[PDB]
Paper text:
Two versions of eOD-GT8 were used: eOD-GT8-mingly, which represents a minimal glycan variant of the antigen used in the trial, and eOD-GT8-mingly-N276, which includes the conserved N276 glycan so as to evaluate its accommodation by the VRC01-class bnAb precursors. Structural analysis revealed that all five antibodies engage the CD4bs with similar binding mode to that of VRC01-class bnAbs. Notably, all five antibodies block the CD4bs by forming beta-sheet interactions with the CD4 binding loop through heavy-chain complementarity-determining region 2 (HCDR2), a key characteristic of VRC01-class bnAbs.
Here, we report on structural characterization of vaccine-elicited VRC01-class bnAb precursors in the IAVI G001 Phase 1 clinical trial with the eOD-GT8 60mer nanoparticle as immunogen. The engineered outer domain (eOD) germline-targeting version 8 (eOD-GT8), which was designed to activate VRC01-class germline-precursor B cells specific for the CD4bs on HIV Env, exemplifies this strategy.
Author numbering:
A (entry chain H): 1 to 52, 52A, 53 to 82, 82A, 82B, 82C, 83 to 100, 100A, ...
B (entry chain L): 9 to 91, 96 to 213
C (entry chain C): 1 to 169
Amino acid sequence: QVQLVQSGAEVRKPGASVKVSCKASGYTFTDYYIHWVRQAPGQGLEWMGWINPNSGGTNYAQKFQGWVTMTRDTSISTAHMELRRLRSDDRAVYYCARGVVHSGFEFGYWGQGTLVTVSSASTKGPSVFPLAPSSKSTSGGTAALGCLVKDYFPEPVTVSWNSGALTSGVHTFPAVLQSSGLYSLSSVVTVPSSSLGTQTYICNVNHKPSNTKVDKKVEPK
Amino acid sequence: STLSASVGDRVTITCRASQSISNWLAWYQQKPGKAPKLLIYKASSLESGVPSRFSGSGSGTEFTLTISSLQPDDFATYYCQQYETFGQGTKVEIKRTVAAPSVFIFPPSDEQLKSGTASVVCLLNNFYPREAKVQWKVDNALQSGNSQESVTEQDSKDSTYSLSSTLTLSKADYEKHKVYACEVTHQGLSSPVTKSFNRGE
Amino acid sequence: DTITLPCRPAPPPHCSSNITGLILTRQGGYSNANTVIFRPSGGDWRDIARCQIAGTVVSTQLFLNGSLAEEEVVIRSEDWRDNAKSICVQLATSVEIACTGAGHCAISRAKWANTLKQIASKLREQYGAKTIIFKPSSGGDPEFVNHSFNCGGEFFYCASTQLFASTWF
Ligand SMILES: *[C@@H]1O[C@H](CO)[C@@H](O)[C@H](O)[C@H]1NC(C)=O
Ligand SMILES: *[C@@H]1O[C@H](CO)[C@@H](O)[C@H](O)[C@H]1NC(C)=O
């Protein structure tokens, strides 16, 4: 079983450095090349370079020549890639890939990916605000209501409605980075209009990095 | 570069690359939030653990990936690769009937209006296709540059999309205007649907 | 003028040999600016045995006391467009390297520069009328980032930075 396990998510200040690990298992670590491919949020795959685990040699792309350093540690079968002079546009996911050939570019084995975000912001709990339903939110026979999770850092954050007892019709939108450097999302849920005057809806927002757990009750009108 | 196909349709994705003596061309499939999977190497040869409905052919500079019959598992994004160069992705989504959006608007909460920033939220729920247009209006003045949109992925059952547009104003600017409205244009709507409110009511 | 390569430890003058070939690696990323960069091989020992032109002398980057070509410089590779496969270079006329014995091995700067242009010319036949650039090694273990070899059972390491720092239009 050939598997590649990478390090967890990393948050770095701009201009610092990040060292990502990629541990190999199930095969002879020193025989096969190891590549590194980054992927922007909605953009495509970008090859950065490979490293020769036996000789230690490397071959970076010209776009990254000078900003990337690839090393390996044969005692632990782990390949390291360090990126220096970090910038805000370097926020992406970095995969390590191994080919089916000894030194082929046909990548048949991938790591799970390492999310690396570069931001100047500091850890801050979210400010949870309700999205109250009213006549302006009763398009037809159904109604809509939600919670606005605003100004938190870093990702992620979990949103629950009535402590998992309400899942049908729930939509939790992906987080969007605001101009202030803080994340923000909205989680909505659609219920019958008759249930507004009979059911109570409380959203449970949970932020692990800041250790802040917020509960807000949404009321009609 | 989006492809709307149904279960059972035939899909041929064409990749324009350089000609190779050995026809070096690889295809990949990627799911949301998952690492890519190798489907085909050397233009035509398949991969172990890949269904036979995938195939490839490459003569000269035209290389194509073909799915004989789309299954629910095949709806993803596909990349072609030639050595270290990767191409643009081609997302294959599920095709269904047109569903008009359900428009909802939310004024800023009283709890928020203590911090100095007002947030109005316009919600478009359960619609197909993804191409929708939201236009903000403040005192019948068209707005631009002061909003952010967020779309969900295609739902697993009804195969629809959901969209949220948040208008962000300062409390000084919010309390200087009365009527706030988001207009919605969609193929399912015979006319633009407008949802507005008055500040304080 | 000569080119003095720092070597550790000091190789005796009788370990001087003839340079018969090189093994290179093309830099990844197609610049599309008629510019191709070549560095010493970032490959292991599998790349050297593929060339078959290296002699019985254990050696990296440069080939010592190997087999020469006939009347013309020959360039070979398993795939020319795969930057992961090394590029074997076989010289027509050898380049003599003489080690002083005080931690330095000398090479004729004129002869090395003349053979460097003929390698850049034969590479243009494989990649088009482009500018050829030679840069130092990208890194690695001491046996591969440096020009390494053995001589009677003793291991030697020489820095070859001065051999790969030229641009040819
Ligand atoms: C190469 O051959 C010469 C001439 O026979 C010899 O003196 C020298 O030691 C050889 N080089 C090596 C590295 O064995
Ligand atoms: C190198 O080749 C020359 C002829 O070109 C030969 O005389 C000599 O012995 C060889 N070896 C050395 C170490 O110069």
